[PDB]
Design a protein around this ligand. Structure first.
Ligand SMILES: *[C@H](C)[C@H]1/C(=C/c2[nH]c(/C=C3N=C(/C=C4\NC(=O)C(CC)=C4C)C(C)=C\3CCC(=O)O)c(CCC(=O)O)c2C)NC(=O)[C@@H]1C
Ligand SMILES: *[C@H](C)[C@H]1/C(=C/c2[nH]c(/C=C3N=C(/C=C4\NC(=O)C(CC)=C4C)C(C)=C\3CCC(=O)O)c(CCC(=O)O)c2C)NC(=O)[C@@H]1C
Ligand SMILES: *[C@H](C)[C@H]1/C(=C/c2[nH]c(/C=C3N=C(/C=C4\NC(=O)C(CC)=C4C)C(C)=C\3CCC(=O)O)c(CCC(=O)O)c2C)NC(=O)[C@@H]1C
Ligand SMILES: *[C@H](C)[C@H]1/C(=C/c2[nH]c(/C=C3N=C(/C=C4\NC(=O)C(CC)=C4C)C(C)=C\3CCC(=O)O)c(CCC(=O)O)c2C)NC(=O)[C@@H]1C
Ligand SMILES: *[C@H](C)[C@H]1/C(=C/c2[nH]c(/C=C3N=C(/C=C4\NC(=O)C(CC)=C4C)C(C)=C\3CCC(=O)O)c(CCC(=O)O)c2C)NC(=O)[C@@H]1C
Ligand SMILES: *[C@H](C)[C@H]1/C(=C/c2[nH]c(/C=C3N=C(/C=C4\NC(=O)C(CC)=C4C)C(C)=C\3CCC(=O)O)c(CCC(=O)O)c2C)NC(=O)[C@@H]1C
Ligand SMILES: *[C@H](C)[C@H]1/C(=C/c2[nH]c(/C=C3N=C(/C=C4\NC(=O)C(CC)=C4C)C(C)=C\3CCC(=O)O)c(CCC(=O)O)c2C)NC(=O)[C@@H]1C
Ligand SMILES: *[C@H](C)[C@H]1/C(=C/c2[nH]c(/C=C3N=C(/C=C4\NC(=O)C(CC)=C4C)C(C)=C\3CCC(=O)O)c(CCC(=O)O)c2C)NC(=O)[C@@H]1C
Ligand SMILES: *[C@H](C)[C@H]1/C(=C/c2[nH]c(/C=C3N=C(/C=C4\NC(=O)C(CC)=C4C)C(C)=C\3CCC(=O)O)c(CCC(=O)O)c2C)NC(=O)[C@@H]1C
Ligand SMILES: *[C@H](C)[C@H]1/C(=C/c2[nH]c(/C=C3N=C(/C=C4\NC(=O)C(CC)=C4C)C(C)=C\3CCC(=O)O)c(CCC(=O)O)c2C)NC(=O)[C@@H]1C
Ligand SMILES: *[C@H](C)[C@H]1/C(=C/c2[nH]c(/C=C3N=C(/C=C4\NC(=O)C(CC)=C4C)C(C)=C\3CCC(=O)O)c(CCC(=O)O)c2C)NC(=O)[C@@H]1C
Lengths: 172, 73, 273, 162, 162, 172, 172, 172, 162
């Protein structure tokens, strides 16, 4: 796998060099944010179930046909899959968020996701929609927690977004 | 399982191993929590020395413990 | 790519041709050195039988080279039906199995372990079968014996490449297809030092084998349904590795043993080594 | 899809053998029964609606609080869904009668039942009442084997739900 | 042993599921058939002997040379065996009628048939004639479904032998 | 496996003989009862869930310790198993009932069960108890249906009992 | 898998509706023919060995070269395969005939068959031929049985044909 | 093609709705920046030749082997291609920059490029490197012009970067 | 999709050349106009509904017979559709204002217009009136360049329809 640190290493390696002092200072700083970073993740995991539940409700209110006979979320068995998938995507996103790197997410999840979806007949656009619905709800929690020391999480929040979006894009 | 003849084709010294069986080691292909077989809670197998180390390590990590080891002959 | 018509308006069997394009063959109408569109590095055309000879000569007389030719009728055929492999079925060999039940397992094992490939009366193994049904051997152990057997080696391992043999192995021993270039690399190294027996041992010994159909269950196709730690592309690779029912792994056919899964496709799922 | 006919084929196919007398006997069973089964389906199909209304209703009597505001039984959307759902159950049951196997039920209704229900917090209990109430009504329009068949399938779901 | 009843149990058992309507339908098929089957068995059982004599005999007519000295058909021991064997075939057939499946046949007769026959140089052909001759006689004592059943099983062997 | 018919065959085989006319008459009559036999089975399967549910409640009301910390039905994980097992036993019993023979039950369920339970420290006594509790409830249904043609099922009822009891005994 | 009944269901499902009365009447009628249907199947299975044997003889009388060195049915090993294949196809066809639906035949047997044959160098033409030879022989039996109540089986006979033909076509 | 405006439209269309007021405000803002946006583009185009020239020199100073016999930039013919390619990528990037959208770049230019390079034996790594070298030089101009009204272009500068990076990544 | 920006890119791209001054000039034009365009869109978006009602209505006044039974204008379904359709036209127009090109209009509305209309026997005439009526209303809420823009696009459709 890969993550923020490992990545920087690898770059350095191809140049063939010891790490730039400048480059260390990226990592040094990255460390300092850890605590923030962690709490962010904690927030997602803590609310997981709900994030999904929520997103789903909204997804199905919008795209009524998915749940109608002939649609992709009907019948039960299919519905179940659709829920499962949502979760997975989320799970990965979280992972990435901790790592500080997209990698883990796309190669395991998005590299064949579109093709699978195609073969199944699952409508990629709707999937993407779901991913966003999730995104917004999730950020909601990340950004509004309780009993955490008040401060600015924006930086993390945006990176979170990006991950969600990479997902949306590659699926779509 | 009493060996009728040397089970293994490839040849080394063979050792019978009797194990208490975790459900995991032999899960039945059944809905719900998988159950090892009642008739054998203590599978006994014949193993070549070379395979003996891998077999024991895999047995170990799964719940079940070696009841006894006996040379297969 | 998909072909929309099997035959030309004038009767004529269309044939899909795949080439590596060359700047001469198609170039942008732009100033500077001619460049083919990158997206069409591998171009495909469907030509009637009549123009096929001319088409191919021209391609080759330029720097083109032909990747493969295939009849349009085989092409533009449904992706295989997954009906039988969506739910494998599964066979359990109880203790105190009566005569018939043991027979069923045996058959099923030969089916999965060898592919559709037919096993003749002389090929079949009495000794191994003997052991099963007076106890002494697990279904798991029988499966090991089959992969040790020369029959197995002659079809899968002695004709094709070790690269091919690995995935061939994966499919037979585990329903899954291979995920990632690493798995292929690991097995190859195992084979070089430990040899053929150790490699065969490492699939049955692996926990993935144990977790599903661990003992006394004939292996079934886990791939084609969602598995833990499986790359999404692996699912697509399962469609390449498994072509229909009544499609086999056959040394017998022309250039029999080739790779179903292109090396590049494996690289996509994961790289690192 | 699991019906009598498909199964015997499957079993024959696994062993690798032609359909012999064993299997045909079985098939014959399915066909002779059909007459009763088919009858039952005609009866349910016709009274569908009425059965559904009655059921939905029942559920509310059984669980008054559902209809209170801020609950799930409350507000028409939900009621509509509730209706829809039961319709489905019924629909499938008919199917299964005709197909002569649980097949249709298993694949549409049962597979994934739990998780769906969990994630949306649908209480199995409800459905069950619906069914029971139905069973009771059906226990008038039908009789003899036709009835017996209807029950079997209805129950099959009760058990799956519970 | 493969009979209708045993199989459905087996299938149910494998999946780990209760016997549902699907299987019972099948069972019902068997046991309904039984009445005919049973009748057939009573008929064969009674005429056994006579059928056997006739068959053995036939074989010799069909293959005169067997009775010549230095052949297999020659000398009483062999004739005795020949009789015995056919008796067996018959015996099993009856069994299978009653059991309502090929089971009995498969396990006694069919499994290992080839190799036995090879090692002792019994020509399948012979047996076959025996059977055919039988089939012809049976085609008088029986009629309608009873007959049909008898045939099925008799044939089943012909095919296994050939 | 085995069942009433197959069994009789096998016996006959070792004698080396055609089936005795007497013996046929066992089977002949066995057939006649089929319909009853079937309904019996149908009744169990139809009520399965309930039978268990019921039995359990009663089992735990009696042996309160099983569900207390240190008992064998605690914690959840264990409880689950205990329920599952009960069910299985039931399932088999039914099978037997249809076959018209104990075998299936003995071979693929009962055999070795005692010893397992022992090794685990499961109290065999209690298991047996459960089986009986089940028995009574089950008979309850078999014997009191609605919309079936009224008649005498006793014969079947008793055979049912026996199966339950073989179970109880071999476990105990 | 699929068969006549299940199929009609599925269609109905996507419309989202109860089965049309018209549609029932297809199935109702289908039932009535059962007995005929069954006997048809029984006839094939009963004659199986022969059907093949026969067809083969004729196949090889026509295309002498198949059995000559360099041909596709030579040597023994190959011959064996060729026989077995014929049989299989037959087996499936029968299955279909009972189901009242091509599917089983298409999915298990016909799907990919052409391509296999191609890769091996097996001459698809000849295969197809064999299938027909079989067809005719088979019908022969279906249509001329002994001890069966006399009536009209045409309907079934034709459906049988079709199955054989689907085979012939897709192989060819 | 696509660009920032058209994109937003399309999204809106699938929802089936008029544009969100929020969404307008993205576009409204985008307009305001235009002048800046333009100058950025103008800067690249004006310096094009140079940007490349420069990057190349540096590329070849680093990876001497490319220009050695047996390397990929040798002989002349190849060298020429290598230069041409660099330029193209640049050209597209510019296009994107104006559009306010990656698409054009991805679809016409980047798509398939990796694989091509692979098949030829072009070392993707080096290509990527070149792209970066270009990036830095280009920004250089964008960010340091003369006779432009002084103000903050950062926003644009970063977007520029991203485009370059998408390129680098997809090639690599 | 055809907007100013996309076109110049396209043209540049075809020739294989960098965007030079020529094209930027053009782009600049698009951006200057936008302010007016955007304004117009805000105005249409807000009054949408009211415009639609008015239009639909108008059409009926203009073509009374449509509302008679057995005609197209008759029965709510049709009226609903009629409304929907005009909404669409409007929707797209707004889009086009914002995109700064006919693009959106061309691809959604115009391409295939004829055949659709032929096959369903929608008379272009109708639509036209709708539009005209609209144009007239818009001719109050807007003024100066904003207005001018609105018109352009509205007309563009009239011409395409006719
Ligand atoms: C839900 C938000 C939307 C949706 C999804 C959907 N997916 C399936 C089925 C599958 N999807 C996958 C994909 C994955 N495999 C993996 O390992 C991962 C994570 C790395 C994913 C995301 C697979 C393999 C399946 C098949 C599952 C199976 O075989 O049981 C369905 C059901 C379709 C089916 O026939 O299986 C659905 C509905 N589509 C929608 O309708 C939603 C908008
Ligand atoms: C960000 C989304 C919201 C937020 C975060 C935030 N956290 C801290 C500080 C800490 N967070 C943790 C949390 C953990 N550290 C761990 O090791 C673990 C796993 C066991 C967790 C969950 C810790 C220990 C700290 C330090 C003490 C503290 O809680 O303050 C801050 C303070 C700044 C900083 O850490 O640099 C902030 C801002 N707070 C918000 O308001 C955001 C919405
Ligand atoms: C230069 C930095 C590196 C390099 C480049 C290089 N490219 C080729 C050959 C080709 N490059 C392309 C690229 C494109 N074609 C397109 O149409 C587009 C844009 C739409 C791109 C970006 C293509 C298609 C070719 C192959 C065919 C052709 O000539 O057009 C070469 C020469 C490879 C050869 O052997 O012919 C080179 C050298 N490689 C390097 O050495 C640099 C690291
Ligand atoms: C006989 C009519 C013709 C013929 C046949 C032939 N087939 C093979 C080899 C195979 N054919 C199959 C067939 C099937 N696979 C299936 O699973 C099914 C349906 C389930 C069928 C019908 C397969 C799997 C094989 C490949 C495996 C193997 O060959 O062992 C051959 C042998 C090819 C060889 O060169 O060895 C032949 C000869 N060929 C003829 O000559 C007839 C026209
Ligand atoms: C009726 C007793 C109660 C009730 C039901 C209710 N159901 C939902 C939501 C769903 N119900 C189902 C059921 C099915 N749909 C299918 O396709 C199948 C298989 C064929 C079944 C059994 C499903 C899948 C859903 C989820 C998706 C959906 O939007 O329907 C709700 C709404 C829950 C929510 O909005 O999250 C309700 C309320 N309503 C009542 O009043 C009773 C208490
Ligand atoms: C009758 C057509 C011919 C014939 C028969 C014959 N059989 C044997 C020897 C054997 N026959 C069998 C057959 C069976 N024994 C079984 O238990 C069963 C299954 C229930 C069968 C079908 C077997 C097993 C043997 C081997 C030895 C034995 O007799 O048990 C012989 C003796 C041949 C020899 O040299 O071994 C003969 C002659 N006799 C005739 O006259 C016909 C030609
Ligand atoms: C419930 C009435 C009582 C009870 C049950 C209980 N069982 C276990 C564990 C097992 N029980 C079995 C039984 C079977 N497994 C099978 O495969 C079959 C059919 C062939 C049976 C009947 C087995 C094998 C196990 C062991 C593995 C497993 O987890 O299933 C437990 C848990 C034992 C433990 O300590 O882990 C329990 C609780 N025990 C009671 O306390 C109840 C009175
Ligand atoms: C016995 C426990 C209780 C009871 C049973 C009973 N049943 C019948 C008659 C029939 N029961 C069936 C049922 C089936 N036949 C099948 O094929 C299947 C599976 C698809 C079932 C479940 C049938 C068809 C009959 C025949 C007549 C009928 O329509 O019921 C009787 C009457 C005696 C007889 O066997 O003919 C009885 C007594 N009813 C009781 O009173 C017992 C408490
Ligand atoms: C048609 C190809 C030829 C033919 C068949 C035929 N059969 C019947 C009637 C019956 N045949 C059976 C046979 C079975 N039913 C089963 O359940 C089984 C498997 C266990 C078999 C083998 C039965 C029971 C019947 C009904 C009783 C009877 O034989 O009368 C008919 C008559 C039509 C009808 O039954 O509706 C026909 C025509 N006879 C021909 O002449 C065709 C060449
Ligand atoms: C950004 C990288 C640098 C920067 C830019 C900057 N530009 C302006 C303002 C304008 N620049 C232009 C440019 C054009 N308008 C056109 O129509 C064309 C194509 C024909 C061009 C090239 C114009 C007209 C303006 C407005 C008037 C002016 O005198 O500039 C600004 C001012 C802010 C604004 O948006 O008006 C800025 C900041 N300045 C820097 O320092 C950056 C490095
Ligand atoms: C309103 C002026 C009159 C009217 C209209 C009417 N329209 C239809 C049907 C369709 N109208 C359209 C138009 C569009 N659909 C699109 O997708 C687009 C572009 C995005 C447009 C402009 C279409 C395509 C249809 C056909 C599909 C459908 O009908 O749903 C009807 C229905 C006529 C019929 O079904 O035969 C009607 C009646 N009716 C009135 O009241 C006015 C006279």
């Amino acid at each position: 796998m890969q993550d923020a640190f490992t990545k920087a290493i690898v770059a350095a390696d191809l140049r063939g060099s010891f790490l730039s002092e400048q480059e260390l200072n990226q990592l040094t700083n990255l460390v300092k944010e850890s605590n923030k970073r962690l709490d962010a993740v904690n927030a997602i995991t803590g609310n997981a179930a709900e994030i999904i539940s929520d997103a789903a409700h909204k997804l199905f209110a919008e795209q009524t046909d998915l749940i109608r006979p002939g649609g992709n979320a009907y019948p039960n068995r299919r519905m179940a899959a659709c829920l499962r998938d949502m979760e997975i995507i989320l799970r990965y996103v979280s992972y990435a968020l901790l790592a500080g790197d997209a990698s883990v997410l796309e190669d395991r999840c998005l590299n064949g996701l579109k093709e699978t979806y195609v073969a199944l007949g699952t409508p990629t656009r709707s999937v993407a929609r779901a991913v966003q619905l999730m995104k917004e709800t999730a950020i909601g929690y990340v950004n509004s927690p309780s009993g955490v020391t008040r401060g600015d999480c924006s930086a993390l929040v945006n990176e979170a977004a990006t991950y969600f979006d990479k997902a949306a894009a590659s699926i779509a | 399982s009493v060996l009728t003849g040397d089970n293994q084709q490839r040849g080394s010294k063979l050792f019978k191993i009797t194990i208490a069986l975790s459900p995991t080691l032999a899960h039945h292909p059944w809905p719900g929590l998988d159950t090892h077989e009642p008739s054998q809670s203590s599978y006994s197998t014949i193993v070549s020395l070379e395979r003996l180390l891998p077999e024991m390590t895999r047995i170990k990590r799964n719940g079940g413990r070696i009841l006894e080891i006996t040379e297969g002959e | 790519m998909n072909v929309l018509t099997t035959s030309s308006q004038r009767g004529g069997k269309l044939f899909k041709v795949t080439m590596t394009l060359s700047p001469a063959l198609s170039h942008h109408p732009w100033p500077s050195l001619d460049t083919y569109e990158p997206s069409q590095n591998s171009y495909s055309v469907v030509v009637p039988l009549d123009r096929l000879l001319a088409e191919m000569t021209y391609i080759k007389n330029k720097g083109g080279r032909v990747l493969d030719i295939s009849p349009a009728d085989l092409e533009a055929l449904g992706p295989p039906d997954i009906s039988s492999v969506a739910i494998p079925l599964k066979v359990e060999l109880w203790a105190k199995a009566d005569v018939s039940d043991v027979q069923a397992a045996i058959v099923a094992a030969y089916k999965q372990i060898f592919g559709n490939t037919y096993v003749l009366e002389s090929e079949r193994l009495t000794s191994a079968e003997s052991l099963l049904r007076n106890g002494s051997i697990s279904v798991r152990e029988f499966v090991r014996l089959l992969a040790k057997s020369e029959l197995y080696k002659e079809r899968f391992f002695f004709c094709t490449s070790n690269n091919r043999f690995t995935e061939l192995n994966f499919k037979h021993f585990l329903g899954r297809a291979p995920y990632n270039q690493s798995e292929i690399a690991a097995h190859l190294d195992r084979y070089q030092t430990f040899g053929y027996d150790a490699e065969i041992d490492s699939y049955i010994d692996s926990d993935e084998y144990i977790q599903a159909f661990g003992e006394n269950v004939v292996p079934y196709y886990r791939g084609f349904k969602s598995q833990s730690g499986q790359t999404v592309e692996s699912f697509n690779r399962m469609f390449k590795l498994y072509r229909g029912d009544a499609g086999s792994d056959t040394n017998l056919n022309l250039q029999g043993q080739k790779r179903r899964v292109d090396p590049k496709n494996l690289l996509r799922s994961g790289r690192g080594i | 899809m699991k019906t009598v006919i498909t199964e015997v084929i499957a079993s024959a196919d696994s062993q690798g053998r032609f359909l012999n007398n064993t299997e045909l006997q079985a098939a014959n069973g399915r066909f002779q029964r059909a007459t009763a089964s088919m009858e039952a389906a005609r009866a349910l199909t016709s009274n569908a609606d009425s059965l559904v209304k009655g059921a939905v209703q029942e559920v509310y009597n059984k669980f008054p609080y559902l209809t209170q505001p801020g609950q799930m039984g409350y507000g028409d959307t939900n009621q509509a869904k509730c209706a829809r759902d039961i319709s489905h159950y019924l629909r499938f049951i008919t199917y299964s009668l005709v197909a002569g196997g649980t097949g249709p039920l298993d694949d549409y209704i049962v597979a994934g039942l739990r998780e769906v229900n969990r994630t949306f917090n649908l209480s199995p209990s409800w459905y069950i009442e619906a069914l029971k109430h139905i069973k009771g009504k059906v226990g008038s329009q039908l009789s003899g084997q036709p009835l017996t068949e209807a029950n079997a399938y209805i129950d099959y779901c009760i058990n799956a739900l519970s």
